């Protein structure tokens, strides 16, 4: 279609910042424009319509949220080959759930309380 000279790049989200426990927090991240040849350039060289937000809403976590959220561990799926038994792996889904209303929430909430369990393990496929 059309060549690309400039693109937006983003750093990692900082910590959720708030006055109040719960919604209404703020994460900020670095956003800058770069030339495709790899150097930082003027922000006005990138298309502003494509400019990622340097801010997003977030949930300010406090100890008293512990009982309201938890990890839901989906079941291990098919043993996939890696290319007796032949080495393979299986994956599973893992989500943070607001327990009462039973709906998705951001991983970083459940993370504050318990580390995220693994999405992958080894498995053997029978000959």
From Swiss-Prot:
| Domain TSP type-1 residue range list | 4-63, 67-127
Illness the protein is tied to: Autoantibodies against THSD7A have been detected in serum and glomeruli from patients with idiopathic membranous nephropathy. The majority of the autoantibodies react with the two most N-terminal TSP type-1 domains.
Q: Which protein is depicted? A: Thrombospondin type-1 domain-containing protein 7A
* Full protein segment contained here: 54 to 191 of 1657
- What modifications does the entry list under PTM / processing? Proteolytic cleavage in the extracellular region generates a 210 kDa soluble form. Extensively N-glycosylated.
Question: Domains: what does the record tell us?
Answer: Sequence analysis combined with the expression of constructs corresponding each to two or three adjacent TSP type-1 domains suggests the presence of 21 TSP type-1 domains; not all of these are detected by standard bioinformatic tools.
Tissue specificity as recorded in UniProt: Detected on kidney podocytes along the glomerular capillary wall (at protein level).
| Organism encoding this protein | Homo sapiens
């Amino acid at each position: 279609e059309a060549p690309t000279l400039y693109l937006w790049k983003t750093g990692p989200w900082g910590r959720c910042m708030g006055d109040e426990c719960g919604p209404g927090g703020i994460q900020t991240r670095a956003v800058w424009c770069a030339h495709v040849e790899g150097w930082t350039t003027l922000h006005t060289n990138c298309k502003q319509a494509e400019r990622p937000n340097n801010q997003q809403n977030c949930f300010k976590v406090c100890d008293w949220h512990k009982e309201l959220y938890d990890w839901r561990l989906g079941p291990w799926n098919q043993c996939q080959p890696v290319i007796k038994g032949e080495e393979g792996i299986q994956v599973r889904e893992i989500a943070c759930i607001q327990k009462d209303k039973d709906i998705p929430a951001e991983d970083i909430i459940c993370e504050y309380f318990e580390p995220k369990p693994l999405l992958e393990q080894a498995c053997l496929i029978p000959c």
